[PDB]
Amino acid sequence: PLAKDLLHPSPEEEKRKHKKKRLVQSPNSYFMDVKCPGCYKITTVFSHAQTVVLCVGCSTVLCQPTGGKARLTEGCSFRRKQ
Amino acid sequence: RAKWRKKRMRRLKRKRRKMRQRSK
Amino acid sequence: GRMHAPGKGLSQSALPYRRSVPTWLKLTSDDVKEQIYKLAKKGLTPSQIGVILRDSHGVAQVRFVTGNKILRILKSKGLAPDLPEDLYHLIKKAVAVRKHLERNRKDKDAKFRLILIESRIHRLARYYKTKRVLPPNWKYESSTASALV
Amino acid sequence: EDVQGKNCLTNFHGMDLTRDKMCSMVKKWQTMIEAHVDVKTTDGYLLRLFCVGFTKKRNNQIRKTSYAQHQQVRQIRKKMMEIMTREV
Amino acid sequence: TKKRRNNGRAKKGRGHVQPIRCTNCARCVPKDKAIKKFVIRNIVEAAAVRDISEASVFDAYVLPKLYVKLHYCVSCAIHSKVVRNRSREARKDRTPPPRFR
Amino acid sequence: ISIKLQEEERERRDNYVPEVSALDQEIIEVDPDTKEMLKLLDFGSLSNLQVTQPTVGMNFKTPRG
RNA sequence: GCGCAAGACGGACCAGAGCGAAAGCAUUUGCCAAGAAUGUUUUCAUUAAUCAAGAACGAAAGUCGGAGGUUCGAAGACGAUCAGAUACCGUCGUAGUUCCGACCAUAAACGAUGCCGACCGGCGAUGCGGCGGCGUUAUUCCCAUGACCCGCCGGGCAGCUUCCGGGAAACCAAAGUCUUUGGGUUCCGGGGGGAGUAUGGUUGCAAAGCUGAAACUUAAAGGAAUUGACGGAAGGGCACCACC
Ligand SMILES: [Zn+2]
Numbered sequence: 001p002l003a004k005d006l007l008h009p010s011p012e013e014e015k016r017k018h019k020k021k022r023l024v025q026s027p028n029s030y031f032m033d034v035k036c037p038g039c040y041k042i043t044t045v046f047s048h049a050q051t052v053v054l055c056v057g058c059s060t061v062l063c064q065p066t067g068g069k070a071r072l073t074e075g076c077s078f079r080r081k082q
Numbered sequence: 083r084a085k086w087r088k089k090r091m092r093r094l095k096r097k098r099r100k101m102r103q104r105s106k
Numbered sequence: 107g108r109m110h111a112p113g114k115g116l117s118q119s120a121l122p123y124r125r126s127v128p129t130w131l132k133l134t135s136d137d138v139k140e141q142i143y144k145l146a147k148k149g150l151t152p153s154q155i156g157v158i159l160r161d162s163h164g165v166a167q168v169r170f171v172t173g174n175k176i177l178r179i180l181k182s183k184g185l186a187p188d189l190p191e192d193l194y195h196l197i198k199k200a201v202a203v204r205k206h207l208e209r210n211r212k213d214k215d216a217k218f219r220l221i222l223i224e225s226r227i228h229r230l231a232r233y234y235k236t237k238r239v240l241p242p243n244w245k246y247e248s249s250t251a252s253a254l255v
Numbered sequence: 256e257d258v259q260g261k262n263c264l265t266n267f268h269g270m271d272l273t274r275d276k277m278c279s280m281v282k283k284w285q286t287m288i289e290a291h292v293d294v295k296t297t298d299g300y301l302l303r304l305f306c307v308g309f310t311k312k313r314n315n316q317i318r319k320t321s322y323a324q325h326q327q328v329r330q331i332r333k334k335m336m337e338i339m340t341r342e343v
Numbered sequence: 344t345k346k347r348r349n350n351g352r353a354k355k356g357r358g359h360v361q362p363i364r365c366t367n368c369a370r371c372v373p374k375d376k377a378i379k380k381f382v383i384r385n386i387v388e389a390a391a392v393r394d395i396s397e398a399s400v401f402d403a404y405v406l407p408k409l410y411v412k413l414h415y416c417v418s419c420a421i422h423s424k425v426v427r428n429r430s431r432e433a434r435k436d437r438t439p440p441p442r443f444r
Numbered sequence: 445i446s447i448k449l450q451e452e453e454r455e456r457r458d459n460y461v462p463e464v465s466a467l468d469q470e471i472i473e474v475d476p477d478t479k480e481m482l483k484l485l486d487f488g489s490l491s492n493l494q495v496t497q498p499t500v501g502m503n504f505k506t507p508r509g
Numbered sequence: 510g511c512g513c514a515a516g517a518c519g520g521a522c523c524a525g526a527g528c529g530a531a532a533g534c535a536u537u538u539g540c541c542a543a544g545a546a547u548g549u550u551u552u553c554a555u556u557a558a559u560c561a562a563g564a565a566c567g568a569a570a571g572u573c574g575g576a577g578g579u580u581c582g583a584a585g586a587c588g589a590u591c592a593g594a595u596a597c598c599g600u601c602g603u604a605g606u607u608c609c610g611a612c613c614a615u616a617a618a619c620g621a622u623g624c625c626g627a628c629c630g631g632c633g634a635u636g637c638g639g640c641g642g643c644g645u646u647a648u649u650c651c652c653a654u655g656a657c658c659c660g661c662c663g664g665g666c667a668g669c670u671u672c673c674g675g676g677a678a679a680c681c682a683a684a685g686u687c688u689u690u691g692g693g694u695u696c697c698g699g700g701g702g703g704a705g706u707a708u709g710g711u712u713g714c715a716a717a718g719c720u721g722a723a724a725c726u727u728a729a730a731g732g733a734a735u736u737g738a739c740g741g742a743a744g745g746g747c748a749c750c751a752c753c
Contacts, residue, residue: 018662019120027120027550028640031164044130044164048549051161068548068639074652081130091706096716107625109557111545112530115664117638119549153552166550176552192553199543206542214566218530219543221565233556278410278521284509287522291537309522313657315501315645319509320524320635327655332537344679344733350620353525356666358618359533359568363520375525412521427743437525500644502659508634 030080036060037075044081045070110222127171131164135172138165139179146185152176153191189254190239193230197246198255199223204248224248277307284320286310288328290335294343302343306335347434351417352376365416367423378415378426383408 014022029047036043039058049070053062063070072078107114141163145155155176159165169175180186187194203220207213227246234240257264281287288308295301308331310321323331353375354360362371386409387395395406420426474482474493482488 016661018116020116020118021662024123025120027122029548029550031166031550044162046161046164046550049161050157050549050551053161066548071653082128091704092717095706108545110530113545113664115546117547117549117663119551121550124550151552156551157549158551160549160551170550175554190553192556203542210541213542215529216542218565223543230556237556273407275407275410279408281521283522283524285522289536311656313646315503316657317503317505317507318635318657319507320526321656322526323656336537345621349525355525357527357533358529358531361535374523410521421742424743429743498643502643505658 032078033081034062034072034076034078036062045078110226121167125170131171133163133165133171138168138171142168142176142179143183143185146180146183151191152180190230190234193227193234194255196223196227196230197251200227200248201252201255204251280307280309282309285312286321286323286328288323288331288335290332290339292336292339292343294340296343304339304343306339308335363414365419366413367419368416370416370418372414372416374414376417378417378420380413380415380425382411382413384411385409 009023019026019028031044032047034043034045034053036055036058039055039060041055041058043053043055043062045053045063047069049063050065052064053070054060055062061073062076063072065071138159141159142155145158150158152175156168159168165171168179172179177186189197200220200223203216203223207216207220210216224246231240231244231246235242235244256266286309288310290306291303293301293303310323312321349355352373354373360373360375363374363377364370365372365377386407392406396404415423415425421428470492471494472492473496475498476495477498479493479495482490482493
């Protein structure tokens, strides 16, 4: 060390740090776009959702809250938004 | 030992309570 | 660190640099406010409304969408309550700790926690009275508190 | 219970392990889990059954200790308590 | 002056530790300060095994053992030569004595 | 002691090299991770190499206690 | 040996492990309220740090009334040892030790080290929460879920190492960032005794707690480390002026 470049840390260095301790703060969460296996509507869900998210009319549970990221039910797929 | 001397100095005070009162 | 605890935890939220609404969220400001009014009439506090919106409708921040905050929106429409939510939840906990304390007279530790809770209540009440949110004659009564809750 | 002409006839009265067995089983860096149930049999006998069990180390484990968390031993005790009841 | 960094104990991050009685004195010692030994011995010594198997009615009988946990105060572990004194630097060696060799 | 005749004898012992060295091998066994390092070293055209299967169980520590 | 009862106590698992503001906390199950840490693209928006007065809790012992009294056991009565023993050892044994309700506010209550905040070296572990990754196992499968394995992040109890720097040194990653002397704030010390004593005030049923001098006396008392001498401290070696 003793000559570490504090201005330009590598992407592998910054992704390993705590979110508040990075050079600029950034969340580790995202919005993911979930599809019910039976229903056709496509629903946006927070990665760390605290509420049991369910379809408005198709009456199907999409996820269950846990201590970290919410857990999707079996048969439901997703993909990160942008 | 200071513990014993502390005990000794307390008996003297307890007796002087009796031998030195407001009624004296 | 914590006010009434020796802890020094660091967990919190980290807002992104982007103050801008993403392109995939197509909800207009007026439609976002309509959900705020709708959920305000089901007895939801602003902090509950925020998590509901975040988890379901893709609304990360309403200050970023509508350019205002939830409590200000509710107060402008007239849906804000009498006591602020943080002071409301502190008085509710004081009644619960005090209600447990008549069936349990030898519970010496709830007696310590109640002192801490009421100290926190007094701190918030002082702050709000300096801000002209509570009337200057407002005072927290340990017996009458249930009337506020 | 009876003496039928120079022979005395016996019935089941209890059961237990040996002190040597128990003391050999009790080791340090693991966890002990115990339970007790009262169950009455169909024919009218009331019994109290005690059960013991110890946490096991894995084949590739590198750590020294194999302790179980408190809610993990309340589940195990709950399972000991129901299997002993149904089988008596 | 201070001799040991751990004050002769194992207490860290707690206030009170329940006491126990020395096996030899019946003296109250904190559990983290007492000198503890687990002894697994044989009931019969090697001076009696040859006279025990010849009288045993079971072929290949394995004789039982005896398990005792012993607690000592600092004074008895030294008098009974369970624990010795050692130099200032050697005091920092906390590896068990090479008995397992 | 030190005899210069013994020095000469030990130098004759030291001046020993086999006809075929130990470092010229027809095949050199190389891990998949070393192959990528050689790729970064523009040595992907080596013909004496043979990538091998690495060990699967990640058990390289001594048990504690 | 088979039963019955009484009160006390929760062994082994039990660890330089966990929780609590500190005293302190260990059999199962249920109820009641509480709490840290982690997770968070929730909410309020300076609401904060330390604190005269004033308050809550505070080991053990001790004091007042009720209940009960297994064990242990101040006092006391004995038996030994001894030159003497009013002790150490032994046999009994009162108050007490236990519970309920009021007092008492003291400990080597110690990390002998106030609290809040920033910066300053490494390494392996451990407890909790989260995140990722080959592969074993819950018997042969669906996924989650558990038990292992390899890492990363945050908050904890600690450990090893270092010419970071400090110190009288012992030693301390804090006891560092101090003549290159200022982040905020509370309490408290000024050679050794007299003396935490007298006196006044105050609290308490009492025992006592808190506050707290002076006259006089004295050239040292004291802290770290070093060579010896000695030890009714532990290990080795030698000698027919030692033994066998
Ligand atoms: Zn002893």
